[PDB]
């Protein structure tokens, strides 16, 4: 199947309490493999997956210096964007960055991306063609003109459709024993009366990987939609994920409801009935 | 600008009294990132509690996993206490093994 | 490996 490598950056200013908090995390698919925390003691990029530990001393020196330089860049941008949006020095603000690349099962490049945010809202993003930018407002347009004149897109593209793909292929090979796995969800249903006349039917999906999954309820073929409680997909803590969906049904009519499970690790979508 | 965290309290494996397990508290969908999360046993804070590194979803909202190893007994009560700028008082979500 | 290129905003 397809795979992705993604890096996530968060810088949160804290005026009067020192330098901004900086946290960087790298992922291959849904598996974290590196991290950096400005408040941690090591002040180094640290391994978080077994297959990345074999990288040599130069790798960890290079990743530590480059991730520190990204934090210093966010430090300047936090004050610059503070002036763009006419905000005071007293408040805490956040810059978030995500970029990465996707490859196919044969390793071919599929797409690259980079998106930046300010205070949890879109700021600037690279377009699909990896040649132009889309600013979210007139303030971010100032950054766009600055990045256009500096030809930042051409530099970033050479990473996103080149260097990013090169490292993702190597990581997928080095961690083939754990990154090429697909665990199908274990499915079951539970029944919880809420009164003498109604009961909750909860449809469970446990121990699946990757996190992408679909749970839907259905009543006599007619889809249920807004009468369903759907919780966010959650990590089990061991590398797998969990999710459930519930619906309140009248007592005695449980046979009219069906749960439908969709996951790439399943040959055919499952249909459960109490 | 600010979004309140969604809190889920659950165990890694199906609960069974007497057997060691892992107690999870998953907070997601919140902004800003500053948050205080504690795991409670009979109302008292648990000391040895780890958490994942801060990351965010496509809508830029943050998510965190707090976890510790525990042995669930039918007498002990477990919960997750979350404080956030969007909350007027810390939210306590009890652990229900049916959820 | 992540990208080692930056331009301030």
Residue numbers in the entry:
A (entry chain A): 1 to 274
B (entry chain B): 1 to 99
C (entry chain C): 1 to 9
Reproduce passages from the article:
Using this strategy, we developed a panel of TCRs that recognize an endogenously processed neopeptide encompassing a common PIK3CA hotspot mutation restricted by the prevalent human leukocyte antigen (HLA)-A*03:01 allele. Deconvolution of the MS/MS spectrum from HLA-A*03:01+/PIK3CA (H1047L)+ cells divulged a single Mut-containing peptide with the His→Leu substitution occurring at the second position (P2) (ALHGGWTTK; pMut). Mechanistically, immunogenicity to this public NeoAg arises from enhanced neopeptide/HLA complex stability caused by a preferred HLA anchor substitution. Structural studies indicated that the HLA-bound neopeptide presents a comparatively ‘featureless’ surface dominated by the peptide’s backbone.
